[PDB]
Swiss-Prot record, chains A, B, C:
Gene for this chain: SERPINB14
PTM statement from Swiss-Prot or TrEMBL: The N-terminus is blocked.
Extra facts: Much lower abundance than corresponding protein in chicken egg white.
UniProt superkingdom: Eukaryota
The protein's name in its UniProt record: Ovalbumin
Disulphide linkage map: 73-120
Amino acid sequence: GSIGAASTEFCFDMFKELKVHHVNENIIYSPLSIISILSMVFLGARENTKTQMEKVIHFDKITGFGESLESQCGTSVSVHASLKDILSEITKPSDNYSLSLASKLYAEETYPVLPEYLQCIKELYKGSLETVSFQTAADQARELINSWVETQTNGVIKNFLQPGSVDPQTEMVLVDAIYFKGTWEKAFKDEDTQEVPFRITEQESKPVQMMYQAGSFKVATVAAEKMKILELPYASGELSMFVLLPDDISGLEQLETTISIEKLSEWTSSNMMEDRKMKVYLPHMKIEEKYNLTSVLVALGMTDLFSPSANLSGISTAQTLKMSEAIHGAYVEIYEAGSEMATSTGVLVEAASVSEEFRVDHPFLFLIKHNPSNSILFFGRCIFPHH
Amino acid sequence: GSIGAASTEFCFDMFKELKVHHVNENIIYSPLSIISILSMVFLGARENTKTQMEKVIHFDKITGFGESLESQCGTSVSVHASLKDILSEITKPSDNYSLSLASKLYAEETYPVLPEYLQCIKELYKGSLETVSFQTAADQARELINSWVETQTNGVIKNFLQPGSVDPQTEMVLVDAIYFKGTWEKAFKDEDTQEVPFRITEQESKPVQMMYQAGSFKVATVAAEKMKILELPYASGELSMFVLLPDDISGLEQLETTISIEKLSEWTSSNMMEDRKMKVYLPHMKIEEKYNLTSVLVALGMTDLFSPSANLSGISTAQTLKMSEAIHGAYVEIYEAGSEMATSTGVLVEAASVSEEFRVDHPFLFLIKHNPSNSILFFGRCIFPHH
Amino acid sequence: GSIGAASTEFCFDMFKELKVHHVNENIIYSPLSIISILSMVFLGARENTKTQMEKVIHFDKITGFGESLESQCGTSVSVHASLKDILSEITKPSDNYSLSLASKLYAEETYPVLPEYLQCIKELYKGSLETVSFQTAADQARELINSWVETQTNGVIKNFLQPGSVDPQTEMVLVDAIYFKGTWEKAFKDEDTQEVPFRITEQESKPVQMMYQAGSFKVATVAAEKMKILELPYASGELSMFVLLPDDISGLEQLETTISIEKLSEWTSSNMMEDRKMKVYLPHMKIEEKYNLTSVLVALGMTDLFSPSANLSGISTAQTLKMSEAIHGAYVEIYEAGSEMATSTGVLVEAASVSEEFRVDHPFLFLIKHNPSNSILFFGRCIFPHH
């Protein structure tokens, strides 16, 4: 097996879990970056936490029978070689497009990470190590990690880590950043872009800037699922965009449920995809979304990793630590010349457990009273803060 | 035994009846202004209407078991004292915040008002009387009332009285307005505000600006209702904002039914509110709503006041007059530095109107035809006139 | 019968069929221009296509019993007379307004248009022919047609034909344009215009410039439908704008379902319309829309026309063709002095069969894959591609 297939299967399982909490909303995430950071953690996880992460990341399909566990480092020889060669394939330079993947881990000065684990991080993901004091200055370390992410994403992802996400309890933060900017194989003419209505539902429609071009494009029409897939290649044909468009507005739902790595392999088969003379209408796209994947990872069977029984002894034998916050951010912009996209996956670990915080992230009742008169000046039921 | 507690009780009694007409919708109103204006009308009511208003406003508990009619003015000595001292309390001048309560009554020049009732209006509510001709220039009187209310709300509540609210047959209007601009005790840093999802339902979410700060705040954890209340004091601690947030979204409904003056007094007890170091997240709020309380006040028990059996001898002894329209507007804006809030309550008497205008202030279809040929050149449906 | 009545009935049928896909959205379209272009095409059809077009255009009512087809050129004498006299009616010079109806057809050089059909176009629609090379320079043809449309609409409708509409397959294009600039019978004083809230819904409202004037106006009040109609005549009383408005906002929906040519005839009756002293508030309006009426016309009953079985023998004796696209655009601006309005309707005839586009106009699943690694760099669902 390959780790690209693990990324695919994880992508679609995670999408099935994610869509249930974001109905009628835009979704965007990077399977590769999430899988890469989660494998960084998977190397350190041992015993039941490691097997859980292995089944969730689908790295169990990668290892051949025999020579598992710390055959080379952290994981088996198969997963090790797969990780290394994928890092090499992604980081290969190209004059046509720009594509970068960087990994960095920040650690507390007091908390000592295993030198073997740091060396394996340098070997597999060639990620650097910085030592910052979280206990004394957590917010400054947050700002530094955020500036590193911002510069690694060419300023696309600013202020990745939310305020208050890290606190003096956090003792290590594993983060990565993927950035891609390319050009279309067949570009869209700037003059051909005009205003076109876009049907959000059958009832309502909103105007958007639609780019148009006519040419030979790979289209695969799946009638069993009532949907067509269009491939728009980029410069050099090493990266491609796939648009899975259901024939009708009502069909998309069905598609979301039936999509899978197996089904996708059938649909994107080189035989199934047909170069035809097509008129292509593609809208200007700008999608930015940031998620907290802790609940999603737990719902997928990664319960031990966030539990106080997490065995991450492969990272640091001194004391014990566990993961508490896994943040992900994704940005994608499609325009006429090409597209610019950028993602980041952050992970912070710590032994401590905050009992409570007071976060107003769902509807409530608010009350404003005059304390001397003990009278209610204002009372309200807030469902949406801003209409 | 105080008008503040009466305002609390009437607040929740009115919330329970108002919530049925605004499902899945923001709610906001000011109990202090509503009960001030209802006491304004209560002073004039006598016999059955006055007892109804006293029970619904909960001024019966304010008066001790002693003389309650004709004493001081209109009501008992106890209610008179409570009115006067709350009026003095919230109109207290403070350099820290701005809090203003204003009352004013408009009357037809042909309509006669008793001098003792006007002297009482100046005594307790310190409000002025303005004589305008409702029968001749009802629209002009409406615009004048809205301009006065706008100036008293510092431009926040503009065009308060809807068109057709006031009528030429209307005898006497009673209005009041509260404005409060204050700053937080512990402010929110502008840089700490970031975009965060807000979960309207379990499956739906929308992004909002969320201000964060870590500090010592007063929180009470009511486990019986599975809910937590947080207090944010303003400058000098004379006013504070209470956020009642259920632990889960679906619990909100339950809370809205179980909340009451007694339960609010239980939950916000000094022993229950504990000072704790909390991470606090609060969304940018801009909640603005206008209501017609006539139906709700009738449902609450004030049936005679809106019916032709309304006796208002203390208001106008020459001829009887009944109220038929009660409007109420409330606006609340929460930001990082502080908050700005403003409310108004409007009262109308003896209303009826027919035609007189063709005002196009709501969506409509339009037709443009060629009269010689009787052909439709243009047809359309206008919701937004300008884009 | 009269083609004005046909335009009215078709207008309301089309409104019924069109409003279903445009809820909470502005609508505007020209019945006269659409019915004129469709009558142009209707002269060229025979057999079932012609009868279908006649039913949808309601020209079957114009023809008196007897001498229905080929009596005049392509149609009955009654329909021919109606067409010619209507052209003369709305293209009548006047010093009070500017009203123009222009029609023009572009054809491929290799396409052999029947000369008698061209003579009919010149007789009944005053339509000139231009020969353009679609197969060798379709984009130049589109630019020329857009420039002609723009000049005929006095610069209101620019870039009328969207890219991709025309292509080397299109063989003929019929386009007409209506323009009308006029002044009110009773003008709006600029000083009387003030900023007034426009109530889109009951609780949310956006501010709009509102002109005011008082005087004698023709208003009809229909209580059975809970709505009033106001007639604002333009200069010289030859064109008038009708504004029908429900008393409550919620009534509007009902109105849109119950409006009809017969009900409109009832409501705009001379005895129903009454001159009365009225205050008139009317907002500034700038309403522009553009539609593709292929689906709407097919749903009304023009199935054979857009199918490969379309008989357009009256246009070309050889190489029979069929319509592919029917684009329409409308613009209206109402201000104090008067009004400026303009529409265009263009239909392009072609010959195709299988689906020839990959139009991305509804939410879709997109993914960006690294082909060497076969890993998904990005995956997402988008419902709206802009924020």
